[PDB]
Amino acid sequence: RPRFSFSIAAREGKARTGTIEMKRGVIRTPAFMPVGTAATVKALKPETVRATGADIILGNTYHLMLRPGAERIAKLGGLHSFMGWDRPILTDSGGYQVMSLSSLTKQSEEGVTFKSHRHMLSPERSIEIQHLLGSDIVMAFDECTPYPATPSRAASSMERSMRWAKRSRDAFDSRKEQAENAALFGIQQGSVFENLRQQSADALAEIGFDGYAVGGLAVGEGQDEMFRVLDFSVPMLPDDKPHYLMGVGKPDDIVGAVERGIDMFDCVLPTRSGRNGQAFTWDGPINIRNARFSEDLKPLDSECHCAVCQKWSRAYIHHLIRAGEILGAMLMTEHNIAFYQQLMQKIRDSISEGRFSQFAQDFRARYFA
Amino acid sequence: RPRFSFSIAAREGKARTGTIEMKRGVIRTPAFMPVGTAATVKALKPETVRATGADIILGNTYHLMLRPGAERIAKLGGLHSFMGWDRPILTDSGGYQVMSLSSLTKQSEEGVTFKSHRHMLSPERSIEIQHLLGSDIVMAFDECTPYPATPSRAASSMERSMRWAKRSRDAFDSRKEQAENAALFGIQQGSVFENLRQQSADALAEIGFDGYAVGGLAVGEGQDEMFRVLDFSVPMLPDDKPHYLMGVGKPDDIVGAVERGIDMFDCVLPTRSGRNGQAFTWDGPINIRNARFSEDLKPLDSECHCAVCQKWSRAYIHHLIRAGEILGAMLMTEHNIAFYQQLMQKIRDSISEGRFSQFAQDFRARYFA
Ligand SMILES: N#Cc1c[nH]c2nc(N)[nH]c(=O)c12
Ligand SMILES: N#Cc1c[nH]c2nc(N)[nH]c(=O)c12
Ligand SMILES: [Zn+2]
Ligand SMILES: [Zn+2]
Structure with a gap:
């Protein structure tokens, strides 16, 4: 198969159904990605995850860089071999988790330093960790703006994310093996503000990515607000590339998001609940x-x-x-x-x-x- | 198949290999029975237990009578249907567990009353609970003598167990459906004393059982002592019936016990460890x-x-x-x-x-x- 090929087979309103072809397999969309933290979809063997119909699973830069370690997983052959899942794996960038689970954090233009249970995570290091894990779909390193957020804070945050998106793209493209075998998704931010979402969408499209994620909408917003933001946000993204709503997954949330043009989802609800x-x-x-x-x-x-x-x-x-x-x-x-x-x-x-x-x-x- | 048929196909010294045919399936011996407390072999689906090669698993009267309840399991169709294991299941009588896990206990000739987390357990109730669970191999209700034990205490304990063995046999035989579909194993006691083991073996053989378990040797005795007791104990049991060493299972313990004539084993070591x-x-x-x-x-x-x-x-x-x-x-x-x-x-x-x-x-x- 090709490194990456998204094809839309049918549409109805804003909804789309199709496939993403990648070297390790085909992903049917709309798609739900079971979450696999600590290199395991909790309580399930990979063959069981596959038996349920999953085409791809999600891995996390943050948890894996801490335990068992990115370099270690690379030495052992990559995440796929390590956990026994030979299909596509999308890895989150750590942009969200580092601020959600870390004990103490220090944010700066360069990235984020933190202590778990001291580590630094920047666009460059995030991309490299995802490379070491052998990720198929690499996520840009972003900042997930807290909700609610004032327009000023949301703007500053989004602007930083976009600068980080450009740094993520260059880091990814600089590594031949990664650029030729994996795909890179950019992440839209801007809180619930239309003008910020537009600026973010435009910045991301200007840089160019294989797919576009809608970030920041799974941190406290009620469904009504989330749907309202998707209404004007998804149309801002390139139509011919996958639209990934990060962290959203209640059954009804998913149906409503597909109605608004989303093609990919992930969430710990199924497993944790x-x-x-x-x-x-x-x-x-x-x-x-x-x-x-x-x-x-x-x-x-x-x-x-x-x-x-x-x-x-x-x-x-x-x-x-x-x-x-x-x-x-x-x-x-x-x-x-x-x-x-x-x-x-x-x-x-x-x-x-x-x-x-x-x-x-x-x-x-x-x-x- | 027959309700119960033990056939010995080959021998070497005191060791024997053969099969036990029962209505729900064939058991190859020597046999190891994975332990399934709380109606589940911990962390394994029944099909996985079967895939490892297990022909039979062990269930426990004590834990199941407490949660979810014997009568409840009967109403739901029996333990087999409940947990999804359709092969033979051997149920321990509770004789051991009631004194090992219960908060407070009161022992008497009638049986044992106790509080968990007040309940009574007697030979009659134990047999009935195993019937309600739909057990294939029913164990007599006994008393597992603590180790070490003075000869006087060991004798009194064994004598009580033998009276309980007779009561277990009659209770089992009194229930037509159970007597025609399940098997009943007696349990030898007597601590580490040869004369007591002999009296117990003789009493059990006089009553008559489908199989004979060697009880009390998994409560603190070192391997040397256990092997020494098996040396003179197993030969006392009927040769043409299965010999079951309760609670013994370290790999080397098993090999040494087979060398001494044992045909069946159970232990939580594999799972718990x-x-x-x-x-x-x-x-x-x-x-x-x-x-x-x-x-x-x-x-x-x-x-x-x-x-x-x-x-x-x-x-x-x-x-x-x-x-x-x-x-x-x-x-x-x-x-x-x-x-x-x-x-x-x-x-x-x-x-x-x-x-x-x-x-x-x-x-x-x-x-x-
Ligand atoms: N809301 C939300 C998110 C859930 N996962 C995320 N991962 C990243 N990198 N960014 C985000 O905004 C989110
Ligand atoms: N030792 C030992 C035992 C392990 N399980 C047992 N179960 C019963 N009923 N009796 C026993 O003596 C033992
Ligand atoms: Zn189901
Ligand atoms: Zn193995």
């Missing part, structure tokens, strides 16, 4: 720990085709989670990820058949009932 | 958390045919366990159980080929080196 006892169903989420499921023989979801719903009852999983058993986490996580992939498939198919708007409406009606 | 970072290898156990494995690309064991050793490196698993990742527990546990089953296969094959003594010697030489 799964381990906490929340299972997704077409009738809305349920918390399996609830006593009403102690003797419920039905599967997590009545239509779900996943291996978990084919074999075990809500009653068993209820028992497992309430007992703190590892198998409980494994089963809840596989089902949730499988549910998310089934959602993406229904989305792709409906767009391809020109009935996505109807699908969106039917989905909400049942999900919110 | 696996989650703690200990991996079994033909060269002895290793603790994967050790820094010397941070960049070791070799599999857990160089010869192991398990899925874990086919795909992941010690370096990856080291990282997983040190990060507290669930996949670490899953991988360590699958490998350890697979290693134990591979050990049983090597044992069965060597006995069948009349070269078990040589196998025992070669195994120790390398394992202890």
Whole structure:
């Protein structure tokens, strides 16, 4: 396959369905990327992640540079070989995580220094770490502006991100092997302000990237506000390149974002919530720990085709989670990820058949009932 | 198949290899039974347990009567359906666990009352709970004498166990469905005293059971003492019925016990130790958390045919366990159980080929080196 080729096969309104061809495989879009922190999609073997239908997973520059270390993973053969996932992997730049999980931080034009549990992370080092990990889709090193933010602070932050986007591009292009085998996505910032989003989109397009991520919309904004910002933000991005909404993933968030032109998603909800006892169903989420499921023989979801719903009852999983058993986490996580992939498939198919708007409406009606 | 049929195919010294045919399947002996507390072999799907080569797993009357409850499991269809294991399951009687995990206990001729986290457990209730769970191999309700024990205390304890063995037999035989579909094993007690072991063996044989377990030898005795007791204890049991050494499982313990006539084993070592970072290898156990494995690309064991050793490196698993990742527990546990089953296969094959003594010697030489 080519290093990178995004092709749109069908459209309906602002929604699009297609494929991204990369050396390690094809990614069907709209796509949901399970999150793999600490070089593992929590509680799942890579073959199980693949069985649920995932075409690509997300890795993180921040966590991996700390443990087990970027240089170490490179010495061992790369992240793919390390964790046993041979398909595409998108790595976040650390731009967000360094300010979310670090103990103490020092931000400057050069980058961000921090202490975990002292390290420096700059556009150049972020790109290099992603190279050492052997990432297929490299994310530019950005700054995720806190929400809410004053227009002045949002502007300063976005402007810095754009300067960092240019530095990310040059660092990526300077490494032959990386430039020839991986792809680079730029990240749009600007908080919830249209003029800032426009300036960011324009700056990113001027630099040129293989894909464009919409950053900063998963840090406190309610769905109404997020959708409102997507309404004017996505159209600012190049139409012929993938649009990636970072960190967004509640089922209904995803459907609404696809309706607004988004092609890729990632979020820890499926996995994290799964381990906490929340299972997704077409009738809305349920918390399996609830006593009403102690003797419920039905599967997590009545239509779900996943291996978990084919074999075990809500009653068993209820028992497992309430007992703190590892198998409980494994089963809840596989089902949730499988549910998310089934959602993406229904989305792709409906767009391809020109009935996505109807699908969106039917989905909400049942999900919110 | 028949309700129960034990056939010995080959022998070498006191060692035997054969099969136990039961309605839900065939059990190859010598056999190792992975332990499944809380209706789950920790961190493994039942299909994975089966993939490692396990023919039967162990369930526990004590833990299940507390959570989720025996009557509840019966209402839901039985333990097999509940946890998704359709092969034979041996259930311990609770005789041991009630005195090991209970907060406060009250022992009497009638049975044992206790509080967990008030419940009564008697021979009759134990047998009934195992019936409600749908156990294939039911264990008599006994008393596991603490070690060490004075001859007087050991005698009193054993005598009570034998009276309870008779009560267990009658309770089992009184339930038509259970008597026709499951098997009943008696449990030999008597601490480390030959005369008490003899009296117990004789009492059990007089009552008559489908199999005979050697109890009380997994509560503090060193290997030398345990082997010494097995030397005179196993020969006291009926030759044509299975001999089950309860709670014994270190690799070398197993080899030595097979050399002494034991046909079945169970122990939490493989699973519990696996989650703690200990991996079994033909060269002895290793603790994967050790820094010397941070960049070791070799599999857990160089010869192991398990899925874990086919795909992941010690370096990856080291990282997983040190990060507290669930996949670490899953991988360590699958490998350890697979290693134990591979050990049983090597044992069965060597006995069948009349070269078990040589196998025992070669195994120790390398394992202890
Ligand atoms: N909101 C939001 C985000 C979620 N992940 C992100 N990763 C990066 N690099 N930037 C961002 O803005 C976000
Ligand atoms: N030692 C030892 C044992 C391990 N499990 C046991 N289970 C029962 N019922 N009795 C026993 O003596 C033992
Ligand atoms: Zn499911
Ligand atoms: Zn192995």
